[PDB]
Write a protein that holds these residues in place. Structure first.
Motif, PDB file in Angstrom:
ATOM      1  N   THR A  49      -3.285  -9.857  -1.748  1.00  0.00           N
ATOM      2  CA  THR A  49      -1.891 -10.252  -1.653  1.00  0.00           C
ATOM      3  C   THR A  49      -1.568  -9.215  -0.485  1.00  0.00           C
ATOM      4  OG1 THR A  49      -1.287 -10.520  -3.900  1.00  0.00           O
ATOM      5  CG2 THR A  49       0.584  -9.973  -2.536  1.00  0.00           C
ATOM      6  N   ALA A  50      -0.849  -9.843   0.765  1.00  0.00           N
ATOM      7  CA  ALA A  50      -0.304  -9.057   1.912  1.00  0.00           C
ATOM      8  C   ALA A  50       1.321  -9.390   1.872  1.00  0.00           C
ATOM      9  CB  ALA A  50      -0.930  -9.725   3.037  1.00  0.00           C
ATOM     10  N   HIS A  51       1.826  -8.257   2.179  1.00  0.00           N
ATOM     11  CA  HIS A  51       3.352  -8.146   2.157  1.00  0.00           C
ATOM     12  C   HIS A  51       3.806  -7.475   3.447  1.00  0.00           C
ATOM     13  CE1 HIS A  51       4.298  -8.794  -2.138  1.00  0.00           C
ATOM     14  NE2 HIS A  51       3.311  -7.726  -2.380  1.00  0.00           N
ATOM     15  N   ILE A  52       4.418  -8.242   4.222  1.00  0.00           N
ATOM     16  CA  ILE A  52       5.050  -7.628   5.805  1.00  0.00           C
ATOM     17  C   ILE A  52       6.534  -7.537   6.028  1.00  0.00           C
ATOM     18  CG2 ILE A  52       4.844  -8.319   8.319  1.00  0.00           C
ATOM     19  CD1 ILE A  52       2.379 -10.157   6.025  1.00  0.00           C
ATOM     20  N   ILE A  53       7.126  -6.736   6.221  1.00  0.00           N
ATOM     21  CA  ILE A  53       8.396  -6.561   6.243  1.00  0.00           C
ATOM     22  C   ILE A  53       9.212  -5.969   7.577  1.00  0.00           C
ATOM     23  CG2 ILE A  53       8.920  -6.417   3.893  1.00  0.00           C
ATOM     24  CD1 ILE A  53       8.780  -3.530   3.655  1.00  0.00           C
ATOM     25  N   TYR A  54      10.260  -6.335   8.040  1.00  0.00           N
ATOM     26  CA  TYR A  54      10.880  -5.847   9.167  1.00  0.00           C
ATOM     27  C   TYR A  54      12.543  -5.837   9.115  1.00  0.00           C
ATOM     28  CZ  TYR A  54      12.231  -5.171  14.146  1.00  0.00           C
ATOM     29  OH  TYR A  54      12.586  -4.743  15.407  1.00  0.00           O
ATOM     30  N   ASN A  55      13.088  -5.005   9.616  1.00  0.00           N
ATOM     31  CA  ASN A  55      14.662  -5.358   9.774  1.00  0.00           C
ATOM     32  C   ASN A  55      15.058  -4.683  11.098  1.00  0.00           C
ATOM     33  OD1 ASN A  55      15.914  -2.588   9.223  1.00  0.00           O
ATOM     34  ND2 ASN A  55      14.726  -2.637   7.301  1.00  0.00           N
ATOM     35  N   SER A  56      15.931  -5.027  11.698  1.00  0.00           N
ATOM     36  CA  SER A  56      16.791  -4.508  12.929  1.00  0.00           C
ATOM     37  C   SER A  56      17.478  -3.195  12.736  1.00  0.00           C
ATOM     38  CB  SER A  56      18.020  -5.585  13.258  1.00  0.00           C
ATOM     39  OG  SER A  56      19.020  -5.444  12.289  1.00  0.00           O
ATOM     40  N   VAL A  57      17.574  -2.708  11.530  1.00  0.00           N
ATOM     41  CA  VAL A  57      18.213  -1.247  11.180  1.00  0.00           C
ATOM     42  C   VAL A  57      17.028  -0.298  11.512  1.00  0.00           C
ATOM     43  CG1 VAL A  57      19.350   0.455   9.676  1.00  0.00           C
ATOM     44  CG2 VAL A  57      19.567  -2.421   9.560  1.00  0.00           C
ATOM     45  N   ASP A  58      15.906  -0.491  10.824  1.00  0.00           N
ATOM     46  CA  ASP A  58      14.717   0.547  10.960  1.00  0.00           C
ATOM     47  C   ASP A  58      14.064   0.256  12.056  1.00  0.00           C
ATOM     48  OD1 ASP A  58      15.800   2.053   8.673  1.00  0.00           O
ATOM     49  OD2 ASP A  58      14.711   0.612   7.322  1.00  0.00           O
ATOM     50  N   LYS A  59      13.759  -0.893  12.602  1.00  0.00           N
ATOM     51  CA  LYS A  59      12.876  -1.552  13.589  1.00  0.00           C
ATOM     52  C   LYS A  59      11.686  -0.812  13.383  1.00  0.00           C
ATOM     53  CE  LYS A  59      16.921  -1.587  16.874  1.00  0.00           C
ATOM     54  NZ  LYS A  59      16.643  -3.012  17.304  1.00  0.00           N
ATOM     55  N   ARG A  60      11.080  -1.195  12.171  1.00  0.00           N
ATOM     56  CA  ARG A  60       9.702  -0.702  11.862  1.00  0.00           C
ATOM     57  C   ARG A  60       9.079  -1.914  11.022  1.00  0.00           C
ATOM     58  N   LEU A  61       7.642  -2.341  11.839  1.00  0.00           N
ATOM     59  CA  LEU A  61       7.239  -3.413  11.219  1.00  0.00           C
ATOM     60  C   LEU A  61       6.027  -2.856  10.340  1.00  0.00           C
ATOM     61  CD1 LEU A  61       6.303  -6.475  10.952  1.00  0.00           C
ATOM     62  CD2 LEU A  61       5.051  -6.074  12.930  1.00  0.00           C
ATOM     63  N   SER A  62       5.972  -3.006   8.913  1.00  0.00           N
ATOM     64  CA  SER A  62       5.406  -2.418   7.905  1.00  0.00           C
ATOM     65  C   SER A  62       4.640  -3.566   7.081  1.00  0.00           C
ATOM     66  CB  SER A  62       6.362  -1.833   7.019  1.00  0.00           C
ATOM     67  OG  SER A  62       6.534  -0.524   7.491  1.00  0.00           O
ATOM     68  N   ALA A  63       3.302  -3.397   6.730  1.00  0.00           N
ATOM     69  CA  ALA A  63       2.452  -4.508   5.711  1.00  0.00           C
ATOM     70  C   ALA A  63       1.641  -3.620   4.797  1.00  0.00           C
ATOM     71  CB  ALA A  63       1.520  -5.263   6.807  1.00  0.00           C
ATOM     72  N   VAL A  64       1.654  -4.030   3.628  1.00  0.00           N
ATOM     73  CA  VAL A  64       0.911  -3.541   2.443  1.00  0.00           C
ATOM     74  C   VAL A  64       0.104  -4.757   2.199  1.00  0.00           C
ATOM     75  CG1 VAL A  64       1.146  -2.853   0.144  1.00  0.00           C
ATOM     76  CG2 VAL A  64       2.848  -2.178   1.654  1.00  0.00           C
ATOM     77  N   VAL A  65      -1.443  -4.361   1.862  1.00  0.00           N
ATOM     78  CA  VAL A  65      -2.358  -5.380   1.329  1.00  0.00           C
ATOM     79  C   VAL A  65      -2.847  -4.701   0.041  1.00  0.00           C
ATOM     80  CG1 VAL A  65      -4.332  -6.708   2.004  1.00  0.00           C
ATOM     81  CG2 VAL A  65      -2.671  -5.899   3.813  1.00  0.00           C
ATOM     82  N   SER A  66      -3.167  -5.386  -0.739  1.00  0.00           N
ATOM     83  CA  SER A  66      -3.403  -5.076  -2.355  1.00  0.00           C
ATOM     84  C   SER A  66      -4.211  -5.892  -2.905  1.00  0.00           C
ATOM     85  CB  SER A  66      -2.381  -4.106  -3.090  1.00  0.00           C
ATOM     86  OG  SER A  66      -1.503  -5.385  -3.409  1.00  0.00           O
ATOM     87  N   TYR A  67      -5.096  -5.594  -3.754  1.00  0.00           N
ATOM     88  CA  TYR A  67      -5.813  -6.255  -4.953  1.00  0.00           C
ATOM     89  C   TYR A  67      -5.314  -5.759  -6.369  1.00  0.00           C
ATOM     90  CZ  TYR A  67      -9.140  -7.927  -1.158  1.00  0.00           C
ATOM     91  OH  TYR A  67      -9.638  -8.385  -0.114  1.00  0.00           O
ATOM     92  N   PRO A  68      -5.142  -6.532  -7.549  1.00  0.00           N
ATOM     93  CA  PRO A  68      -4.960  -5.978  -8.848  1.00  0.00           C
ATOM     94  C   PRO A  68      -6.054  -4.766  -9.033  1.00  0.00           C
ATOM     95  CG  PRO A  68      -4.992  -8.409  -8.672  1.00  0.00           C
ATOM     96  CD  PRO A  68      -5.488  -8.218  -7.373  1.00  0.00           C
ATOM     97  N   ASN A  69      -5.419  -3.845  -9.808  1.00  0.00           N
ATOM     98  CA  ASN A  69      -6.030  -2.365  -9.992  1.00  0.00           C
ATOM     99  C   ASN A  69      -6.774  -1.829  -9.160  1.00  0.00           C
ATOM    100  OD1 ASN A  69      -5.258  -3.345 -12.970  1.00  0.00           O
ATOM    101  ND2 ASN A  69      -7.113  -4.837 -12.974  1.00  0.00           N
ATOM    102  N   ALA A  70      -6.252  -1.935  -8.064  1.00  0.00           N
ATOM    103  CA  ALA A  70      -6.840  -1.019  -6.772  1.00  0.00           C
ATOM    104  C   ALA A  70      -5.474  -0.392  -6.101  1.00  0.00           C
ATOM    105  CB  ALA A  70      -7.603  -1.925  -5.895  1.00  0.00           C
ATOM    106  N   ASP A  71      -5.952   0.768  -5.364  1.00  0.00           N
ATOM    107  CA  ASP A  71      -4.966   1.272  -4.461  1.00  0.00           C
ATOM    108  C   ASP A  71      -4.666   0.423  -3.010  1.00  0.00           C
ATOM    109  OD1 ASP A  71      -4.921   3.659  -5.925  1.00  0.00           O
ATOM    110  OD2 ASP A  71      -6.162   4.815  -4.626  1.00  0.00           O
ATOM    111  N   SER A  72      -3.377   0.399  -2.868  1.00  0.00           N
ATOM    112  CA  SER A  72      -2.902  -0.329  -1.651  1.00  0.00           C
ATOM    113  C   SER A  72      -3.380   0.235  -0.436  1.00  0.00           C
ATOM    114  CB  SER A  72      -1.306  -0.534  -1.516  1.00  0.00           C
ATOM    115  OG  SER A  72      -1.083  -1.260  -2.741  1.00  0.00           O
TER     116      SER A  72
END
Ligand SMILES: *OCCCCCCNc1c(NCCOCCO[C@H]2O[C@H](CO)[C@@H](O)[C@H](O)[C@@H]2O)c(=O)c1=O
Ligand SMILES: *OCCCCCCNc1c(NCCOCCO[C@H]2O[C@H](CO)[C@@H](O)[C@H](O)[C@@H]2O)c(=O)c1=O
Ligand SMILES: *OCCCCCCNc1c(NCCOCCO[C@H]2O[C@H](CO)[C@@H](O)[C@H](O)[C@@H]2O)c(=O)c1=O
Ligand SMILES: *OCCCCCCNc1c(NCCOCCO[C@H]2O[C@H](CO)[C@@H](O)[C@H](O)[C@@H]2O)c(=O)c1=O
Ligand SMILES: [Ca+2]
Ligand SMILES: [Ca+2]
Ligand SMILES: [Ca+2]
Ligand SMILES: [Ca+2]
Ligand SMILES: [Mn+2]
Ligand SMILES: [Mn+2]
Ligand SMILES: [Mn+2]
Ligand SMILES: [Mn+2]
Lengths: 231, 231, 232, 232
Positions: A49-72
């Motif tokens: 699973t990949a999750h990507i987020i951005y907002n105009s307040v923090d102006k920080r592009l962030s992603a998290v990638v994970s598998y079940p039962n594992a550290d992101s």
DNA sequence: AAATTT
DNA sequence: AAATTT
DNA sequence: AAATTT
DNA sequence: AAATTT
């Protein structure tokens, strides 16, 4: 050339163009040479699973990638996308193989954008044979097991080398506006990278581009279907 | 004492307890002495919008407050809410008056929380006389013009001094979990602060608390219905 | 007595109280004697999905229940819920066993209600934790076992028990109708696993809407599904 | 010819083609001659709200149109859209004027479609910009004027023109039905301002669903609402 | 990621 | 809906 | 935010 | 649904 912002899941280290010496996730601002990377323990054969987020307040592009039962794995970069992207964009998924190869299978994809309110949201949990709200570029196909295959996969289920394909959402997206109080987007996708070779390559990317973006000619392998060169 | 995280719209400078010398927005972590503030050009009589955001990836609590055709005020603070809040919380709005006063009218309120997925979302664009999904504390009332009045307002429409009231969403909210990949919340509210006095006081806050939180005794004026003291 | 509107997934035919001769889905308006039923091919040990819908324009309560790669069962009933329910309600899931038994396992549950300008509520549970503070658990219902909600008693090896009844209600009251609203709507979805060693599994699962202060009626195991104090 | 399903807000009675003797809301299945109509007390110069709903369980297309502090008008028609529409469609708003005229101003527009596990699409426009790249504007339709969408021609002082027709379609095709889907649903909402100096304002606004490559039929001003090539 | 070279 | 035709 | 004091 | 009662 297109204007590209991407999050790369880079399965193959191309040390000659600044990749670290391990599979990594990276934030790509108009160059395949990531502005920021983090180590990624890619699990051959497992649904991620990949999750990507951005907002105009923090102006920080962030992603998290994970598998079940594992550290992101997570990576963030401070960037003002109003200074990089056109006001209107298309969003998409890109993948490539080179002299090494992998399946680049997408099982699901969702996106939300909001400007303060105008909103756009799509969710794909399955892909049909004739998915008219996707623009498929290069080798990308839909309909096989209800999945999106970004890169070529033979009738015996073996991935092919030197392949590139992309899927773009049909509608242009209003990613920023001078008159907006808050703007945000998020994207989520689930993916299955499998290699029978000792070394998988080359990766999958979520990207945002000019609306009329197309696969740069020769952008197989380390260029991930995004960049015409390694500058 | 309760555990409180809040975003304050502070209309009145209490310089004796660390407020800056102007109306401000602030981020309050277990103290009325804001960890971070920004200048706020409060517009007496005009409908304003507040937007609060947090996610477990950036761990940055951010707020933006704006009026139509005016520059926003924004404040952000890096805080890991897993280290501050209990796992389950209630969310709410608080307001107070002291020896100076203001209407503390809420026209709308919406909240979304997500843990990776479990989600909760509510939207109030109007408040009814018997709003069973709100817990009203102190002077807070609903039903007058379809608005929520956090603090006492007389039959001639004049605000009263030395008033405090809060509205909490009925259901507890799962704000963080050790096993979550991503957690996020956002809140939006629209508000109308009016004073016939030269100086409005004391402000409105969005807050997150222990589920069994109640107005601290004597928390009128500069304590904003949140804190039992000014430490 | 409580006011109940429910959709029953009724695994066990109680012919003495009007059930048809087969597992059925039913719409229950203030009585266990369904106003409407349809035949339901319940698949012992398989994960099913239930979908319930209503809006103040059509005033038709409709449900669909399905398993992957199988024909759906669907039932609808014309009812004006403004004339049946209080304005404020709680929403929940109920299940029971009697002489015969079944697991009444809920894997997921979501609900959305909207009144039109617009008031809305939405929750989604795709996992249930040991301490699920936004659920009111009644009777035998427990959360935390494999991230599921078990409405009725099961043993440590997952074997169901007879003479069990439990319910899970969403903590917040829901504004289900309003006289000055232009349109009001709700939908609910849940996924469920009904598994039984018995020739005839019993007794079923229901999605229900009730008065806010609703509790399991005394004695409401078996055919009353934890909803009704009697079979009238 | 295109395939059209529409909800008409018809401000002008064209008795020669089956319109009733009053402003009406109608459901149009591949014909301007509504399969169903209801009386509509259109309020010249006031902001109205239209709500359209459909689901594959009830297979009933329903609309409600209202103004604040006034009784709604509502119309419903039983139709299986799988037997009428292609699987992929575009959704849009259409309006026209003829000898008589009206502003056909859209202040907001939202749409949601879902197929069940689940594929979804949702858009919301609460303002329209000068360069709205996710809308396909057809005929006289323009965006940017006060943040509104003007489906038909208006002058610089906001005065409506006769013999006008325009449409706005959402850029992305929509998956409106699928044979292997358990439940499919859509809803649309828009707010509108119809203002006229004329004794009889004309001709109306429609929400429509069409083949993806739909265009304004040649000559489709006035009573054809930019939807139909003729009055059959 | 594991050899092969300086 | 109002005027004109049949 | 505007006086009143050091 | 199967056994037992009437
Ligand atoms: O933890 C590290 C494991 C993976 C690396 C193991 C193999 N490494 C390796 C290299 N490195 C030089 C890169 O050139 C390889 C060929 O380049 C072509 O193929 C790749 C992968 O598809 C692609 O990125 C390029 O663009 C190009 O198509 C070897 O030579 C070797 O072995
Ligand atoms: O830009 C600045 C304009 C606003 C300030 C103008 C008036 N300032 C002021 C003060 N300051 C001392 C604070 O004490 C005031 C009384 O305190 C009580 O009232 C306030 C407001 O309701 C409240 O915060 C306290 O908790 C308490 O109830 C004056 O004395 C004066 O005038
Ligand atoms: O052809 C398909 C099935 C047809 C019916 C099969 C029923 N089998 C059966 C009955 N029928 C009488 C019903 O009540 C007996 C038990 O009652 C208790 O148990 C049930 C199930 O838990 C519950 O609904 C009741 O409320 C009560 O607790 C038998 O006796 C038998 O065997
Ligand atoms: O009692 C309430 C209203 C009753 C009807 C009033 C109609 N008034 C009227 C008519 N009727 C004949 C209809 O067509 C005349 C004009 O046709 C053109 O204009 C309309 C409106 O823009 C349009 O629908 C047509 O397609 C065409 O462009 C008169 O002639 C008159 O006056
Ligand atoms: Ca690489
Ligand atoms: Ca203060
Ligand atoms: Ca039964
Ligand atoms: Ca007409
Ligand atoms: Mn890289
Ligand atoms: Mn302060
Ligand atoms: Mn039954
Ligand atoms: Mn008509």
């Amino acid at each position: 050339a297109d204007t590209i912002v991407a999050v790369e899941l880079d399965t193959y280290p191309n040390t000659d163009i600044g990749d670290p010496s391990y599979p990594h996730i990276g934030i790509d601002i108009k160059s395949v040479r990531s502005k920021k990377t983090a180590k990624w323990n890619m699990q051959n054969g497992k649904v991620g699973t990949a999750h990507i987020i951005y907002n105009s307040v923090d102006k920080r592009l962030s992603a998290v990638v994970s598998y079940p039962n594992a550290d992101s794995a997570t990576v963030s970069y401070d960037v003002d996308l109003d200074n990089v992207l056109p006001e209107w964009v298309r969003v998409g998924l890109s993948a490539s193989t080179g002299l090494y190869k992998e399946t680049n299978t997408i099982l699901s994809w969702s996106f939300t954008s909001k400007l303060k309110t105008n909103a756009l949201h799509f969710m794909f949990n399955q892909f049909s044979k004739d998915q008219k709200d996707l623009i498929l570029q290069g080798d990308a196909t839909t309909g096989t097991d209800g999945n999106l295959e970004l890169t070529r996969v033979s009738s015996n289920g073996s991935p092919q080398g030197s392949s590139v394909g992309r899927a773009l959402f049909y509608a242009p997206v209003h990613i920023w506006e001078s008159s907006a109080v808050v703007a945000s987007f998020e994207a989520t996708f689930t993916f299955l990278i499998k290699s029978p070779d000792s070394h998988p390559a080359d990766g999958i990317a979520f990207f945002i581009s000019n609306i009329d973006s197309s696969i740069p000619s020769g952008s197989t392998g380390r260029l991930l279907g995004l960049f015409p060169d390694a500058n």
